[PDB]
Design a protein around this ligand. Structure first.
Ligand SMILES: CC(=O)N[C@H]1[C@H]([C@H](O)[C@H](O)CO)O[C@@](OC[C@@H](O)[C@@H](O)[C@@H]2O[C@](O)(C(=O)O)C[C@H](O)[C@H]2NC(C)=O)(C(=O)O)C[C@@H]1O
Ligand SMILES: CC(=O)N[C@H]1[C@H]([C@H](O)[C@H](O)CO)O[C@@](OC[C@@H](O)[C@@H](O)[C@@H]2O[C@](O)(C(=O)O)C[C@H](O)[C@H]2NC(C)=O)(C(=O)O)C[C@@H]1O
Ligand code: NA
Lengths: 652, 655, 658
């Protein structure tokens, strides 16, 4: 590669392996790369009409799978919002459908709050997340809870299962299991009678040992020494451990206030020591630092606030934090174009004391997620709209623009003397749509899997949400919905001593609603599906016919609600026909079955009802007029032929 | 590495073994064409629709507006207007990815009664309004019954300062908004106006001038209002605005060759502020042909007023489907040639809005394709596609009824001065498409060109080798049978200026989630987050109707509604045990009386055919008079089904 | 890239940074004594595409791929595990030279006796002969995967012709004779005609008789009234593949047996020897009973005699520890490769026969190639042969299986000159051309088990790979439900390799469309998504509300709108309310809303209602019964009650019948 300084940007697309240093704003050089300069490329990873944004700062890799958690909503607020993730099982080439991790808050309507999250990661084989409850009205933090589950994982251990005759307690040795009482697990081929299939953790003895309860007592002494068996957690069946974090909430007291929790890093995996970033950007003087948890497994409510110096917390927010080899690294977001901005900091004593390096030129509006690879920090940020990156530049909103994403690479083999000469590289450009002031661009997160690093972050497209227009309600299903979606910049960070794993995708996408063309020539959908909105269809047959050909005897339509309504719309063609016909046979004719016809108010004879039952109409129970002494049985032109009763005297 | 140089070869080499090279080759003696390797042009092809409809004919409707690229086309089933919608797909990312089709016209309201439907090859934007010539054509023979100019305000956003005034006691608010393009009745939206009563969704009440309109307040102002100094937000509501629809006199088939119109095609603006524009047209039905433009001097104030301006007969003979574009006082035009054995496509220009033309015939009888183009700097970039392989060259015969790889071509004509001749025109084969082969018709080409910033787009048709089986089991041309129709759209995106920015490109690795947006819920089930209408028969294993919305609000009333003149809920003949056939309606959760009252209607196949039985442990009641339908014929009880006792206010039966 | 290797090969001590090279290859001994070659981008003009993406366990193209009338077919099985539970034989297809691939189409239904007999279908041998599709459709036990029986299934291929002349009818006859060369049709096959120029020969018809290879008849709806001969008329013909019954023929003794000479473990691979005479071969082996047998089933004329075949085996030396032959016939020579079944015994062998499988010449691959079939095609003088290890590091001879953790198994290709048949394969050069993923949470791997086909200047190795998303069989999904979580990670890939000069401008495109074939959606002028195909949901559906419209695409509105229920009986029921259980009831309405001002109503109250289990009929226009109306029990049910007296009773006779 080669880098040189230009007075004007050249035709960048013509070149390879080149980068151009250019001062768009005088005195603020940035470097613009051509293709081939870095071995990195951008992939779009969500494409839904929700406002999908804010991976900050939650990405992680676990058991070969890359997780990109984010929030799927409709605006910069918690209206209709789920904390969610998408995942990649192919090193970031393709990404799954969004999965909601939080439900809509149970008190959404009553208390006008909903969930939110910017801090999530894995520690000691458990997922941890700071799930915040925020007000719909003003986005203030009402309270915050640490949520945890055992991660989804698989083990193939040998031995370690013992049960005494007469006991219902089975003891299971499983190193660093990370389980808690009540967690859901599964066993196969255990070689220990009664320890099989789906079970629940009954007790935890130590880091490597737990118990489960058998349905019935063992009738011999059991020890599966020598037997190789299979174990899996059941993440989706395990109750979340939910622990309120005291004083983590909005407050008008500057020393209590928390604006956001953000970022997560493990200090000691086996002892559940980790840190969560936080700041107060609501009440001066600001505070920014970490919440340090000495042992989140045994004491999930116990943490201490460890802050950075005031002059680096001023005009700052949203620390990204990562621990490596005894050193905790931190970057901040600057909150003003006209004040000193983002800072890089490190601590060798778990946040009690820091060394600081300010980035020059008031880096602002972006968090700066990063990873350490070898001797370098790879640090990324994205401006919200074109031309806002440079210090002192004004916001550029309300028109469509191409915001720049930047990366720098800082050698920390020893702590740098200064970042005055930092070289930011513009590595990709995104789109800011422009018809609302808010931008989803950036607000990202960095993770690493083997020889690839991922900066996973937001960008938009030029299709308007029409908030100003016919969609002030921000309905995602109207027109093009919201243009905020996620992208992944995947950068090579080590030698790739293997032949390519890459592929082009040429398949029919078939996970969201899996369709196969049947031998009947019709599309079959092979998953249960719930439609959250109004559905119309040309005709409906309810089949009771499953995949393997089993035909149910009872075919069912069920209605929820306080009451169910099956009704007949006013006809468009011939309103005088209006009626609902319920049929015991295949067609609405008495040769095929009994029928009940309920006529509507538009019918020629409005609101009549007629029962047709050639085989006889029967009532199992007493049959009466609703009101006493008012309703006739038969009529003057509709006399029953004869009345049959056990007594021939009418009771008056 | 050919260093962007060109070679003349006796036979085509292994083109995939080179970059930045082009090869001049005469497949047909005397008719050289140039074949490019990767890299010769900074251009690439993207497939932009993938639906089982017959999706074809962007000609000549594409446009770019407020950063979005629009590719209008027709989605139907054949070369005809059966089942067809005028539609578009759009790109919000410079042509990398494209939206679901949106239908712009409904099926014609008189489709069945009058046997006609809509059609469009002319659409564009003038003065912040969408304009289209929406044709009504006969299903039987495709003849043009009538044509209408349709317009709406474009979807757009503004952020103005000041300009809203209201006098005390008035219900009229006056809105200054430059070049608004609105008409009375158009739908708009306001936010943060700083003017009481001017807020949310409103309708244009009157238009005062090009820069000023009014809206009507729900109640009279109680003071003089002027939002001077206030910055506010404005948006049109395109989809809520009525179309203005204007019949175009004599734009229809006619046996009079001076009236007859075969097709309207292409659109270009001459003056945006004064709504002056032209639409291409030709008569290819009645000799002598006519070809030229419909010129509208002011389509805003007088949408029905236009004049015909034709090219000369010499160049109208054997021609059709003019593409027209206006730049800096000059109207440029290309034609489609209609015969392999007569002089073909012509390039022309007019400095007087079509009253006179300067002509340049392309050599070698270019035919069967329209030639859409754009001017960029001193050059016209002109594109065309053969319908099937080997048809491009003059005098070549049609090559249908087998699968082939038709070539797409581009030429680049320097018009800094008008050329002396096109005899030396260099056509570059820039991409190859597929013609499927099992029907004579081809959707290849029939395209359109538009430009956004440093990219030009040729958006056009191609097929694939999957048969529609029109000869086979699908002569009805049902799109949902087998693979439907192979016609879909493609976009060739070509760099046409310096790109002084880092790449905006990305690879698409997302789960596509716009057509039926699905998320996996915390319940472990797929949730679909949009209303959906199924236009065909649906079957399902079981159904629960929930009344449960996204935010968790649960409706008290859960509803199943049936349209039609009458609604039928019926029980098919059982496959396993026909003698059980019955429908059970239940007031509780299961069909047992411990859970609720039940009505069972037995079918004709039941062991006890055609019985009805009502189960109501809490009592069965009728609010109204309850009678036999026939008089004197129906029994109440029976000899072995006696009521225990009868209770009535009078003990005398009325005979 | 930094270094242009200029298509040269380096011998290296350890693999370098391969992604920094183009046009380069590296010979490396991961295992000492077993060199393999690793390629950078550009070394071969070949690239990988993912071609299925569904949550089923989609695997085993082996060895069924083929190209017909410009379309590439990739048949496979869509199921849930290494077994036939819930499984369909299926295919996906490409109409654009392998760039994009269709939704799966099920070719076999679930076996009609799946529940009663506990068996289901399976297939590893399929192809085209004489314009018909042929497949050996196996019936296997769910419990142990043994082969119960096997059937030869065939249909005419979907095809189109544009002939001239050839249709004759005698006056007075209802038989039309159709000349169509090598039609491949059988009696009962479904066809379609257009523009025949022969009265009565039009539209959808059925084959009535077959006269010879080039001639068949159809029956007219009425007798011709003149002598008809459409000589000089150009017309149109299509088969109707999907409307033609399958010809299904049992293959005697192709089944599990404890007799080593009858036992068939699998039928596998297909190749045509003579298209016009319907001579073809199907591979097979017995790997269940020692001594093993491996070879071909040779069908001399499958059209006239689909049940007639002979077994032709390779020598015991090369059948031992072997399975799953891939077989291909070219220019009078039949080539065969085997799968090796042990890492610690001599493995895959390449063989050729000049006499249709009676005698073979053999070449053992060195180093115990095992666990993979080796599909191939011949291009010029060379066989291009492909295989994939099941998990990383299993390829080399003697290496142990490496399961139960996620890994990146290697795919390999070699190129063997068979015009000059080698003396030995000792110096075979295997190239690692792409790497797949083995997910790791179950022992079984879908990687490989592939098939090779060719279209013009491109060769396709179409085969399996996984991804790292677990199926949770150990976890909450031991039932292997595809619709739970991410379903199964097994899906198909196509490695498309340039094999001739490409003397044309690129046909390639990037895909940037909204995928819209599975459930075709358009945004309507009503601002709602419309789905433009019939759809059947095989699982439970919930929806917020439902309107049944009777309104079709062209705007035609049905007078009768229909909801129908299958089953023995249909149930429409009211669940227990979550908000206010005391309201529980179902309201059936003749008008649009549940109020008597809009229509008659029948209200059925639930057991949780304030007044449990009542039924009330509201009929302001009068309630009528056409038929006799009676209590179900005799002498037990009252008509009216003490506080619910009818005003007056009207009957033709005033005496109650007791
Ligand atoms: C991946 C998977 O499905 N694993 C399951 C496993 C498999 O079905 C496998 O084929 C057998 O290892 O079976 C598991 O259940 C074993 C269980 O069915 C029997 O061992 C069973 O176990 C008892 O429940 C018990 O241990 O209390 C009692 C019972 O008498 C006994 N039945 C028989 C015939 O032995 C397993 O291996 O644990 C469950 C896995 O989910
Ligand atoms: C692709 C396709 O739809 N092909 C059909 C084809 C075309 O509709 C077109 O009409 C070409 O002829 O029509 C086919 O049917 C035409 C047939 O209905 C008429 O020829 C009709 O048929 C007779 O009844 C008959 O042959 O028995 C005789 C009768 O006089 C005649 N009626 C008229 C008005 O011509 C075809 O060409 O076969 C069917 C194709 O599916
Ligand atoms: Na097309």
């Amino acid at each position: 590669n080669l880098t040189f300084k230009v007075t004007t940007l050249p035709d960048i697309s013509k070149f390879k392996n080149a980068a151009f240093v250019y001062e768009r704003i005088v005195g603020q050089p940035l470097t613009y790369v051509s293709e081939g300069f870095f071995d990195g490329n951008l992939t779009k990873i969500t494409d839904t009409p929700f406002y999908n944004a804010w991976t900050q700062d939650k990405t992680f890799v676990y058991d070969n799978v890359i997780y990109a958690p984010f929030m799927a909503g409709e605006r910069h607020g918690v209206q209709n919002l789920h904390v969610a993730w998408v995942k990649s099982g192919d090193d970031g080439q393709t990404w799954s459908m969004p999965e909601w991790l939080t439900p809509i808050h149970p008190d959404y309507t009553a208390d006008k709050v909903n969930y939110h999250c910017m801090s999530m990661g894995v520690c000691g084989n458990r997922l941890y997340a700071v799930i915040e409850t925020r007000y719909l009205s003003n986005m203030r933090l009402k309270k915050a809870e640490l949520w945890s589950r055992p991660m989804p994982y698989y083990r193939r251990p040998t031995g370690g299962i013992t049960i005494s005759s007469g006991s219902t307690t089975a003891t299971i040795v499983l190193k660093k299991h990370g389980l808690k009482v009540g967690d859901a697990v599964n066993f196969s081929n255990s070689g220990a009678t009664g320890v099989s299939g789906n079970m629940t953790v009954a007790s935890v003895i130590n880091k490597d040992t737990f118990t489960v309860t058998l349905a019935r007592a063992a009738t011999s002494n059991i020890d599966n020494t020598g037997t190789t068996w299979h174990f899996g957690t059941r993440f989706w069946d395990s109750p979340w451990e939910i622990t309120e974090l005291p004083d983590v909430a909005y407050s008008t007291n500057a020393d209590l206030c928390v604006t956001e929790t953000h970022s997560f890093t493990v200090i000691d995996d086996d002892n559940y020591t980790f840190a969560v970033g936080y700041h107060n950007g609501d009440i001066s003087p600001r505070r920014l630092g970490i919440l340090y948890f000495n042992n989140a497994y045994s004491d999930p409510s116990s943490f201490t606030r460890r802050t950075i110096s005031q002059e680096y917390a001023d005009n700052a927010a949203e620390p990204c934090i990562k621990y490596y080899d005894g050193i905790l690294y931190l970057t901040t977001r600057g909150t003003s174009t006209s004040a000193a901005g983002s800072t890089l900091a490190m601590s060798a004593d778990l946040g009690e004391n820091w060394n600081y390096l300010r980035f020059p030129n008031n880096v602002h509006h972006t968090n700066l997620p990063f990873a350490k690879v070898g001797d370098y920090l790879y640090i990324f940020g994205t401006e919200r709209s074109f031309g806002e990156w440079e210090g002192q530049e004004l916001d550029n909103r309300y028109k469509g623009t191409y915001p720049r994403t930047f990366m720098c690479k800082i050698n920390v083999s020893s702590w740098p003397v200064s970042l005055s000469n930092v070289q930011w590289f513009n590595i990709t450009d995104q789109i800011y749509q422009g018809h609302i002031v808010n931008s989803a661009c950036g607000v990202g997160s960095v993770c690493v899997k083997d020889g690839w690093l991922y900066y996973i972050f937001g960008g938009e497209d030029f299709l308007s949400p029409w908030s100003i227009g016919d969609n002030s309600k921000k309905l995602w299903y109207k027109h093009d919905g919201h243009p905020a979606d996620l992208y992944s910049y995947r950068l090579k960070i080590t030698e790739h001593d293997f032949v390519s794993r890459d592929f082009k995708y040429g398949a029919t996408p078939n996970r969201t609603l899996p369709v196969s063309m049947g031998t009947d020539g019709v599309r079959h959908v092979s998953a249960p599906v719930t439609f959250d909105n109004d559905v119309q269809m040309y005709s409906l047959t309810v089949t009771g016919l499953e995949h393997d050909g089993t035909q149910q005897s009872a075919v069912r339509v069920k209605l929820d609600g306080d009451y169910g309504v099956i009704a007949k719309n006013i006809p468009i063609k011939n309103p005088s026909e209006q009626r609902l016909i319920l049929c015991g046979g295949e067609t609405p004719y008495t040769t095929d079955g009994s029928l009940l016809q309920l006529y509507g108010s538009n019918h020629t004879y409005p609101n009549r009802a007629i029962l047709y039952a050639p085989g006889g109409a029967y009532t199992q129970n007493n049959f009466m007029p609703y009101l006493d002494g008012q309703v006739s049985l038969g009529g003057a032109s509709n006399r029953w032929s004869e009345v049959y009763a056990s007594t021939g005297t009418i009771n008056t």
